[PDB]
Each structure stands twice: as C-alpha cells, then as structure tokens.
Design a protein around this ligand. Sequence first.
Ligand SMILES: CNC(=O)/C=C(\C)OP(=O)(O)OC
Length: 129
Amino acid sequence: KVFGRCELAAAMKRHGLDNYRGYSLGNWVCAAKFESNFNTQATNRNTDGSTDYGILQINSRWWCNDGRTPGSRNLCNIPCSALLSSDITASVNCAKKIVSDGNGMNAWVAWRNRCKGTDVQAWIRGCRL
Ligand SMILES: CNC(=O)/C=C(\C)OP(=O)(O)OC
C-alpha cells in the first residue's frame, strides 16, 4: 500500500505514534516519506547484506528476521515480511522499540539528514486528525 500523507498521519495517530518518546506526528510522517515514500512494500538491501523493510525501513541486522542476514538479531520478534503489510501495526510496534533504544529518531538516518530540525509540522498541515 502507498499511503496518502494525511492517511498515514491518521494511521500513525491511531496506533499511538503521535508524540511517542516526544516525537510529534510530523516527525514520523517526514521519516516515512524519505524512508519509503509512504509505500508499505518498500525494501532496500544494505551493502552489509541486511535489508530494510517497509514504511519506516526497519532493518534486519537488529530488528526483524529475514533468514538471510548472518549474525543479525530479531529484537522485534517478527519476520521482516510482517513489516510490509498494508496494516502498519507491526511496523509501528517495532518502531516504538527502535525509538526507545537510546538515540531517538537518529536511528533513522534519513530522518536525521532530511527531517531533523525542519518544519516537520508541514507534514501534517491540513490533515484532520
Ligand atoms: C532505505 N533504508 C533505510 O534508510 C534504513 C534506515 C536507515 O534504517 P532504520 O530505518 O534506520 O532501520 C532500523
């Protein structure tokens, strides 16, 4: 699924991500924008052989099991495929563990480089939430 901007905002709000660990909904939307362009089925191989999965590009080196990432962990206790669902529940739950790990949303490199410090509120401008 390719979410609309406000559609995704509403889904993230519905699943308790707005102001989770103090990150406003804008931040989650901006991150998903530059991670997946809103597309739940987004996958990208990393040069180290891990893969990033879904709207928030959760990585198999630590978070989810894909069975092909030697040495990795699965700290969200999910197959990475479950991060590709139309329903964002699994991604949202794992993103909550990721963002609580200590470095906040800086774990998402695209958030650091493209969202951090910006007028992230634009991402939810005009949305009925
Ligand atoms: C295209 N994939 C990515 O940008 C992966 C990002 C850095 O990983 P998170 O989303 O940082 O992974 C837990």
